[PDB]
Amino acid sequence: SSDMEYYYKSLYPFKHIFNWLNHSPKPSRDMINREFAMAFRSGAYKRYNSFNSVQDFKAQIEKANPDRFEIGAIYNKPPRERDTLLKSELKALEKELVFDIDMDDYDAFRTCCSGAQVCSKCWKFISLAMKITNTALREDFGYKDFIWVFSGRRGAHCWVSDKRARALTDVQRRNVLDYVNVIRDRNTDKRLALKRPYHPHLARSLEQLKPFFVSIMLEEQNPWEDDQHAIQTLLPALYDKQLIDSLKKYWLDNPRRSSKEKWNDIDQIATSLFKGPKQDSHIIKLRECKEDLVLMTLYPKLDVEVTKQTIHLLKAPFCIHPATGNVCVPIDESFAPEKAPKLIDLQTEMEKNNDVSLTALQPFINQFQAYVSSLLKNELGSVKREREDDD
Amino acid sequence: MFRQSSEEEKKLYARLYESKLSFYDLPPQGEITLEQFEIWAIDRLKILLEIESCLSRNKSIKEIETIIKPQFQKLLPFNTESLEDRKKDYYSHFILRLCFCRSKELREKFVRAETFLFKIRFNMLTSTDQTKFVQSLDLQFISNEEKAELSHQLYQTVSASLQFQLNLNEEHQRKQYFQQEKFIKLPFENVIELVGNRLVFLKDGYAYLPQFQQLNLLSNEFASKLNQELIKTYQYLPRLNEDDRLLPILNHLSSGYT
């Protein structure tokens, strides 16, 4: 508890977070009416907190001293005044469109680690997921004001703060989630349900993920070296029963062939089986299955519960993870979890230097400050454009 | 070469039903009877009740059309020149505004049923009537150069839709239709239901919509404007209370939905 008190009093960037959530150096409804929730070591959890200013925000988080606090929607009236209101009178207006990715969703094909454990070898899943998501957010939706945040142990959170993104309704958020959610079923015993020819989103994502399929899946992770795992995950994605039976029989006779070797065996046995006039169609179908396998293995996997409601609460940036002790820092695609700071290390560095700018947390604060500056500039430009259009 | 050279109410409704469908845009005038008020409201209520019943039974558009179309000739005629039928349709809608503006649940149910009936009747139109009706409502197509630049992406987006919705199994036929097809650009938030199904192409926050789709925009505008009018109709219900002879009828009409 004392370490968290020291962290809030010495290290947490309350000013930059206030500027991000308020969208203004001066106070506004975007902070006064924003819900905040706090989680405590006693097991208690308190909703409907809101703050009048950066000083009030910092003072209340310091006074409560929670393990973490979570960010919610902007409301029509202050959430802290909920005792003066009926439950139907307090209504949401905006919240940042948030996406959540977890490493545990890739355990169908990850091998080097399982569960909440992580390492730089498997985080290439998260890096590619962030790359595809950023390409979608920039090229399809036209967003610019977004930032990624490390969950502290096993995932990454993207906080989109564009004004059109903040204003999305629950129905609109669900449909956006459906647009970016391609692998809608995580079970491995079927080929994907995607229609053909590909939507341009799917085609671009496939072309972005193709160069990394060999190095990651077939070589680094190598999940299909186990014959039973290949029979349970790789073969059901194929289109033909005779091909599946031939591959199963061949691998049971020739066990422990690596994922690359099995990936080549698919082509070789398909070429041996599908001779004749229909050979081109069978080759096309086999290629379709392999493309769907690339998307099945490497496409972003998302937690729908974080995105499907405006009123949802999620762990705020620069929080401390209770188990690992890591800071929930902002990140980019080159990040790995081994690069995250820790509360004990930052306390040691502050004891040695007595300056946050000389700690390991300052590059991440610099990233967040640059993001906040760009966000505020774009907000002011949007206000100017709206005023000119009204005039 | 050779060359040569109240009534207002009737003209109003002839104008309103020239398109064969209406957003129900304008205040009625003149008089009808109270028996007509009750019976016309009950007829439209019966059609909307069956629409909501079929939707609760999860029946498709084709099944609902098969069920509801025989009922127009008995209860609420459509595609008709008769002044009586046109006034019946218009007045029945306006009466059920006053019946169903009273609460959020009633407003939602009435908007849902009336918008689905709007969809059904729009499907009954010819393409010329649909075009004229859309144009009458004062409802941005992309340039040919922009279509050419985005032709690969747009064709990849719509090719499956052309095969399944327009039965164009032949790729040659799909290519010819795509060459003849127009596209509409608007923000992606306006067509988000098509976005969630990945039926439209997205670029820089704008959705690219082919001309043969987009009826959901028309029906959504109908639903939104009807909801706003119902909210307005709710605000001046105290003026309805000056005639006691209408309130039992409206209570009876609303009782079937509660």
Instruction: Using the structure block, give the residue that is written with the tokens 């009633």.
Output: B106
CA B227/CA B112 separation, integer angstroms: 10
| Cα maximum dimension of chain B | 70
Answer whether A164 sits within 8 Å of B198, measured CB to CB. Answer: no
User: Are the C-beta atoms of residues A54 and A14 closer than 8 Å to each other?
Assistant: yes
CA A349/CA A355 separation, integer angstroms: 8
Residue A217: DSSP 8-state = I
CA A325/CA B1 separation, integer angstroms: 95
Q: A360: which residues sit within 8 A by CB, 6+ positions away?
A: A341, A345, A346, A349
User: Are the C-beta atoms of residues A54 and A18 closer than 8 Å to each other?
Assistant: yes
The resolution of the experimental structure, rounded to one decimal in Å, is: 4.6
Sheet holding A97-102, edge to edge: A97-102, A155-160, A146-150, A330-331
Tokens of A267: 């082509």
Answer whether A141 sits within 8 Å of B188, measured CB to CB. Answer: yes
CA B139/CA A95 separation, integer angstroms: 31
Report the DSSP pairing between strands A314-315 and B183-187. unpaired
Tokens of A83: 């005792």
Residues of chain A contacting B206 with CB distance shorter than 8 Å: 142
CA B234/CA B100 separation, integer angstroms: 9
> Could you give the C-alpha distances from A28 to A56, A78, B122, in angstroms and in order?
13, 11, 46
The method recorded for this entry reads: cryo-EM
Residues 121-160 of B with CB under 8 A from A: 152-153, 156-157, 159-160
* A314 φ, ψ (degrees, to nearest 5): -140, 150
Report the DSSP pairing between strands A155-160 and A146-150. antiparallel
Q: B87: which residues sit within 8 A by CB, 6+ positions away?
A: B13, B32
User: Are the C-beta atoms of residues A365 and A14 closer than 8 Å to each other?
Assistant: no
* A238 φ, ψ (degrees, to nearest 5): -85, 160
Indicate the helix (H) or strand (E) that contains A74.
strand A68-75
Chain A residues touching chain B at CB-CB below 8 Å: 139-143, 164, 168, 171-172, 174-179, 195-203
Residues of chain A contacting B201 with CB distance shorter than 8 Å: 199-200
Residues of chain A contacting B159 with CB distance shorter than 8 Å: 197
Q: How many CB pairs under 8 A join A and B?
A: 56
Instruction: Please name the amino acid found at residue A19.
Output: N
Residues of chain B contacting A201 with CB distance shorter than 8 Å: 198, 202
Percentage helix, strand, coil, to 5, in chain A? 55, 10, 35
CA A263/CA B126 separation, integer angstroms: 54
Phi-psi region of A43 (alpha: psi -120 to 50; beta: other; left: phi over 0): left
CA A340/CA A320 separation, integer angstroms: 11
Q: A131: which residues sit within 8 A by CB, 6+ positions away?
A: A208, A333
Beta bridge partners of A156: A101, A150
CA B229/CA A75 separation, integer angstroms: 26
**By C-alpha distance, which of A344, A346, A313, A301 is closest to A188?**
A301
Length of chain A, in residues: 391
Tokens of A8: 């809030």
Q: In 3-state terms, what secondary structure has residue A130? A: helix
CA B55/CA B108 separation, integer angstroms: 14
Indicate the helix (H) or strand (E) that contains A99.
strand A97-102
Is A104 annotated in the active site?
no
Instruction: Using the structure block, give the residue that is written with the tokens 């004392």.
Output: A2
Q: Where are the alpha helices (DSSP H) in chain B?
A: 7-16, 34-56, 61-72, 83-100, 104-124, 127-136, 144-149, 151-165, 171-180, 192-196, 215-235, 237-240, 247-255
> A314-326 burial by CB neighbour count: b if 16+ within 10 A, else e?
bbbbbbbbeebbb
Instruction: Using the structure block, give the residue that is written with the tokens 């009178």.
Output: A89
Q: Give how far A158 is from chain B: nearest CA, Å.
A: 18
CA B50/CA B64 separation, integer angstroms: 9
Tokens of B203: 């670029």
Long-range residue pairs from B10-19, CB within 8 A, at least 24 positions apart, any chain = B10/B83, B13/B83, B13/B86, B13/B87, B13/B90, B14/B83, B14/B86, B16/B86, B16/B90, B17/B86, B17/B89, B18/B132, B18/B136, B19/B129, B19/B132, B19/B133, B19/B136
Long-range residue pairs from A58-62, CB within 8 A, at least 24 positions apart, any chain = A58/A8, A58/A12, A58/A14, A61/A8, A61/A12, A61/A14, A62/A5, A62/A8, A62/A9
Dihedral over Cα of B183, B202, A376, A160: its sign: positive
Q: In 3-state terms, what secondary structure has residue A149? A: strand
User: Are the C-beta atoms of residues B80 and B108 closer than 8 Å to each other?
Assistant: no
User: Are the C-beta atoms of residues A22 and A29 closer than 8 Å to each other?
Assistant: no
Q: In chain B, after which residues does the backbone break, taking C–N over 2.5 angstroms as a break?
A: 5, 139
User: Are the C-beta atoms of residues B50 and B67 closer than 8 Å to each other?
Assistant: yes
Residues 180-239 of B with CB under 8 A from A: 187-189, 192-193, 195-198, 201-206
Distance of CA A70 to the CA centre of its chain: 16
What is the dihedral angle through the alpha carbons of A235, A239, A242, A245, rounded to the nearest 10 degrees? 10
Answer whether B189 sits within 8 Å of A164, measured CB to CB. Answer: yes
**By C-alpha distance, which of B73, B76, B165, B74 is closest to B113?**
B76
Beta bridge partners of B187: B206
Residue A13: CB atoms within 10 Å: 19
Residue A170: DSSP 8-state = H
Q: In 3-state terms, what secondary structure has residue B42? A: helix
User: Are the C-beta atoms of residues A225 and A257 closer than 8 Å to each other?
Assistant: yes
* A232 φ, ψ (degrees, to nearest 5): -90, -20
Residue A199: DSSP 8-state = P
Instruction: Please name the amino acid found at residue B202.
Output: L
> Could you give the C-alpha distances from B163 to A196, A210, A236, B210, in angstroms and in order?
11, 28, 27, 14
Rg, C-alpha atoms of chain B = 22
Report the DSSP pairing between strands B206-210 and A45-49. unpaired
Is A226 annotated in the active site?
no
Long-range residue pairs from A38-41, CB within 8 A, at least 24 positions apart, any chain = A38/A64, A38/A66, A38/A68, A38/A69, A38/A70, A39/A66, A39/A67, A39/A68, A39/A69, A39/A70, A40/A64, A40/A66, A40/A67, A41/A1, A41/A67
Length of chain B, in residues: 258
Top residue of A97, A139, A140, A299 to mutate, by most chain B CBs within 10 Å, is A140
Answer whether B160 sits within 8 Å of A200, measured CB to CB. Answer: no
Answer whether A142 sits within 8 Å of B193, measured CB to CB. Answer: no
User: Are the C-beta atoms of residues B96 and B249 closer than 8 Å to each other?
Assistant: no
Residue A337: DSSP 8-state = G
CA A299/CA A320 separation, integer angstroms: 29
Q: In 3-state terms, what secondary structure has residue B79? A: coil
CA A332/CA A126 separation, integer angstroms: 10
Instruction: Using the structure block, give the residue that is written with the tokens 């203004």.
Output: A24
Nearest CB to A141 within list B193, B201, B205: B205
> Could you give the C-alpha distances from A95 to A61, A168, A307, B115, in angstroms and in order?
21, 8, 10, 30
Tokens of A199: 């939507």
Instruction: Using the structure block, give the residue that is written with the tokens 């508890």.
Output: A1
Instruction: Using the structure block, give the residue that is written with the tokens 């909703």.
Output: A47
CA B103/CA A347 separation, integer angstroms: 58
CA B158/CA B168 separation, integer angstroms: 11
**By C-alpha distance, which of A149, A158, A61 is closest to A326?**
A149
Is A145 annotated in the active site?
no
Phi-psi region of B78 (alpha: psi -120 to 50; beta: other; left: phi over 0): beta
CA A101/CA B93 separation, integer angstroms: 49
Answer whether B198 sits within 8 Å of A179, measured CB to CB. Answer: yes
CA A325/CA B72 separation, integer angstroms: 69
* B146 φ, ψ (degrees, to nearest 5): -65, -35
Q: Where are the alpha helices (DSSP H) in A11-53?
A: 14-22, 29-32
CA B205/CA A142 separation, integer angstroms: 5
Q: A346: which residues sit within 8 A by CB, 6+ positions away?
A: A7, A11, A327, A359, A360, A361
Q: B58: which residues sit within 8 A by CB, 6+ positions away?
A: none
Instruction: Using the structure block, give the residue that is written with the tokens 């908007």.
Output: B111
**By C-alpha distance, which of A281, A284, A280, A252 is closest to A265?**
A252
CA A143/CA A158 separation, integer angstroms: 12
